Amino acid sequence: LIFIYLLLMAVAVFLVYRTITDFREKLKHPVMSVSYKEVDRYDAPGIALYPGQAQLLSCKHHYEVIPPLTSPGQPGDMNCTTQRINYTDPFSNQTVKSALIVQGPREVKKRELVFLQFRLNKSSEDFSAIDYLLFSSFQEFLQSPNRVGFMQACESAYSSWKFSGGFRTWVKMSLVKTKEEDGREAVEFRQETSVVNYIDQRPAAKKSAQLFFVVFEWKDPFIQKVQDIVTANPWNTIALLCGAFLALFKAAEFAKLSIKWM
Amino acid sequence: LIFIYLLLMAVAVFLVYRTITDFREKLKHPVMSVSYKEVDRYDAPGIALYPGQAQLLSCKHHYEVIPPLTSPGQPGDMNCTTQRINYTDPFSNQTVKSALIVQGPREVKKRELVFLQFRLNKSSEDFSAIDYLLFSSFQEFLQSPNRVGFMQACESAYSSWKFSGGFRTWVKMSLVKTKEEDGREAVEFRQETSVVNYIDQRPAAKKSAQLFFVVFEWKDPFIQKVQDIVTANPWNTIALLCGAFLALFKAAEFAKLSIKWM
Amino acid sequence: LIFIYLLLMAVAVFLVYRTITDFREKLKHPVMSVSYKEVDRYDAPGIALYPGQAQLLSCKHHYEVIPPLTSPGQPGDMNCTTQRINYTDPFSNQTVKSALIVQGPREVKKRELVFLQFRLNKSSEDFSAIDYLLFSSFQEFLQSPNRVGFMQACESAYSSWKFSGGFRTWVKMSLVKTKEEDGREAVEFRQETSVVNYIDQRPAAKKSAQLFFVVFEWKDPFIQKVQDIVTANPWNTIALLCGAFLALFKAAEFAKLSIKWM
Structure with missing residues (x-):
């Protein structure tokens, strides 16, 4: 016993x-649980292009599924809510990095895409590109005091991408919202590129000026909520x-x- | 008490x-559980190319690891099970979108890759590309009644990609099967691109005709089964x-x- | 009762x-648990380039965030720990595949990036590219006996990528370590490409020699530990x-x- x-x-x-x-x-x-919450219309995303010396020639919201024939090389119609700012990034506070904010497409269900055009006068770079950062809501930036702080925070809260010359980077940007245990939900952007070579036959002259193109589009109406579970x-x-x-x-x-x- | x-x-x-x-x-x-089930030979995948005005010049199943030297610009040997269909997509039922289905490689373990070539006679598009959708089984399409319905369903069940001129989009397509709680298992395709610029020195004449290339390959023998767990x-x-x-x-x-x- | x-x-x-x-x-x-363990300095990654007939012209560790203006076409300063080996891969043991290993950037927090340049004398390929494999630690290779076995094992333990001509593939390589239940932790690399077209205006002569470029960078200081949980x-x-x-x-x-x- x-x-x-x-x-x-x-x-x-x-x-x-x-x-x-x-x-x-x-x-x-x-363990993590990932859930997809279909959304009919995404909040206006903020695209922080860093043209540098590049000159925007055109920006439009092409509600259609395919861009129409354009008039490359010369300035065109501007139909975007573009905000411009110059600030100093925290990682390189010594230098001032000028940005250029644009309002991205909202009608994801209707396949709305915003098509941009950039041009740079002859330089000696030989690797020409324009950086761009994406943040969740453009209106939030448009109505937030001390935009410099907002942009500096975004510089740390989002990774740096870019697109280059003779190309049409068709960036199918998408959301993935992360919830840390403390309760706050950080939002990160996923985006897959599809470079489309630019057929420069139309000028066929001594213009030969760097021309950039981009098509920011919402990949699908699903927002990938990722949350850790104890x-x-x-x-x-x-x-x-x-x-x-x-x-x-x-x-x-x-x-x-x-x-x-x- | x-x-x-x-x-x-x-x-x-x-x-x-x-x-x-x-x-x-x-x-x-x-919570989600992801398991990789090694497969020796994938089922014949269905690549739904949308040439439009483009003209296929060659299609082959290169059992080797590297494509051999080709004869670009002119028609070549055709060695693919290509199916052609014209239908109207549900999202743009007004317009008729002609597709072109091809049988992809099966021998993943052998690094079998199907190499395609497309050509488009001089046009004024200025951004020339050919869309392509991937669906799990090509035979299922080849032996299913009312192919129009199948293609229209795929148009919604798969996202839209494309490849452009002067390029060899080496699309390492891979499988990811999702099981929703109801029991049915939806299958989605992942694929990472690697653009390879085309060195057009061989013609070196006034041909200058848009030439496209693609190499559809199975990334690895693993099928990523993703299933939610309660x-x-x-x-x-x-x-x-x-x-x-x-x-x-x-x-x-x-x-x-x-x-x-x- | x-x-x-x-x-x-x-x-x-x-x-x-x-x-x-x-x-x-x-x-x-x-079920799987994924955790991100911030690391201040990654271990020197090993980049196994396979130039073939291509000739390295320059390799440097650019501690800055942006590459400076270079002198393309001609040999330049080499500032990399490059290891060269010729071996036979298990999948094609019949053929001998010569590699070229380089020591990648370590200072992830400082945005340190290694910029390479390659050149190939006129050939008849028309699709010119240089393969490259990534393995976790370069020093481990530099101090491991029977390097042939190490490279052959890596050929199976890592997938094959490449970059092509007239481009600057900015490969933001990132780490993901997988732990199988047995206890051993396999390490895999994730990496997202951003092709940057090379503006070849500087030579503007009959040189027209294939020039390749790459910028291997650490995407972020987070190592994605993925481990299955019973x-x-x-x-x-x-x-x-x-x-x-x-x-x-x-x-x-x-x-x-x-x-x-x-």
């Missing part, structure tokens, strides 16, 4: 250590341990009935 | 609240709650022994 | 069956089941009190 009681107590202690260690492990490695909470652990403790008490009590039997 | 009994009852009520709220939460945010089920919850309720009953009964002691 | 006892026994049998089945299911589909372990299952068994015993005993009542 004493032997089996000691065995049961050893099982209980082993189980307590077991569950405590398993709870410690399950707190370090929370699979282990002390509540379930304590309930399970109490159930096991009672399970052991009943076995010990049945040992007394066995003693009476013998 | 009454005070401790009321305390135990309050613990029971607040704990059943705990568990019911947590269970309600755990249905909303199911971490919480009512019966684990009810068992845990019953264990906790018994654990509370035993404490209340030990309170009677304490009363006898005092 | 016998009817309710049989009902309780049937419930117990159903519950044990269901718990065993659910434990069997939860062992097949383990949500079900026999120990929780047995504790829950025996707690439910006790919950059944107490109900059966309350049935006796009900009998006494009636």
Whole structure:
């Protein structure tokens, strides 16, 4: 009887250590749940182009699925809500980096895409490109005090991309919102590029001026919500341990009935 | 005694609240499990190219790892199971969009890749590209009645890509199958592009005709099965709650022994 | 009384069956936990370029954020720890594939990037590119016996990429470490390309020699640790089941009190 009681107590202690260690492990490695919430119209995204010396020639919201034939090389109709700012980025506070903010397409369901055009007069770069950062809401920037702070924060909160000459980078930008355990939800942008070579036959002259193109489009109406989940909470652990403790008490009590039997 | 009994009852009520709220939460945010099932030979994938005015010049299944030297510009050997169809997409039912379906490589382990060539006679598009959609099984399309319905369904069930001129888009297409809770398993295609500029020195004449190239390849023999998991089920919850309720009953009964002691 | 006892026994049998089945299911589909561990300085990555006939012209570690103006076409300063090897890959053991290993950037926080230049004398390929494989630690290769075995293993442990002519493939290489249940942690590279067309105006002569460019950079200081988790372990299952068994015993005993009542 004493032997089996000691065995049961050893099982209980082993189980307590077991569950405590398993709870410690399950707190370090929370599992993630990713859910897609279809959205009919995305909030106006903010595209932070950094033209530098480049000159915008045209910007439009092509509600259609395919851009129409344009008139490249010369200035064209401007039909975008473009905001311009000059600030100093925190990572290179010494230098001032001028940006150029544009309002991206909203009608994702209707396949609305904003097509841009840029041009740069002859220079000696030999690797010409225009950076661009994407942030979730353009209106939020358009109505936020101290735009310099907002842009500096975005410089850290978003990674740097770019597009180059003789190309039409068709950036199918998409959202992925991350929720950290503290409750706040950070929003990050995913985007897949598809470079489309520019057939420069139309000028066919000594113009030969760097011409850039981009088509910012919403990949699909799904917003990928990614949130970490803590699979282990002390509540379930304590309930399970109490159930096991009672399970052991009943076995010990049945040992007394066995003693009476013998 | 009454005070401790009321305390135990309050613990029971607040704990059943705990568990019911947590269970309600755990249905909303199911956790995901991703498993890779190595496959020796993928099912013949269906590549739905939309040449438009472009003219296919060559299509082959290069069992080797590297394409050999070709004869660009002029028609070449055709060695692909190409299916042609004209239909109207649901999103643009007004217009008729002609497709061109091809049978992709199967021998993933052997690094089998299907290399295509397209050509377009001089036009005034100025951004020339050929769309292409990928669907899981080409034979399923080749033996399914009402191909128009199948293609229209695919137009919604797969995203739109394309490749452009003077390029060799080496699309390393890969599979990712999703299982929704209802039981059906939707299949989606992932594919990473690697644009390879075309060195057009060979013609070096007034031909200067848009020439496209693509190399559809299976990235690896792994099919990424993604399935959502409901971490919480009512019966684990009810068992845990019953264990906790018994654990509370035993404490209340030990309170009677304490009363006898005092 | 016998009817309710049989009902309780049937419930117990159903519950044990269901718990065993659910434990069997939860062992097949383990859930994954992905954690990002910020790293100040990545270990020197090993870039296994396969120039073939191409001739390296320059390699440098640009601690700045932007490459400076270069002197394309002619040999330049070489400031990289380049290792050269010729071996035979397992998949094509018949042929010998010569590689060229380079020491990649380490100072991720400083936006340190290694910029390379390659050149190929006139050939008849018309699709010119240089393959490159990424492996986690360059020093590990630099101090490992039988480098041929290391390279052959990497040929299977990493996928094949490449960059082409007239381009500056800005490969923002990033790390993702996978832990299989056995305990070993396989390391894989994710990398997103951004092709930047090369404006070849500077030579403007009959040189017209294939020039390749690449900028290998660390995307961000986060290492994506991906590890599978077994949500079900026999120990929780047995504790829950025996707690439910006790919950059944107490109900059966309350049935006796009900009998006494009636």
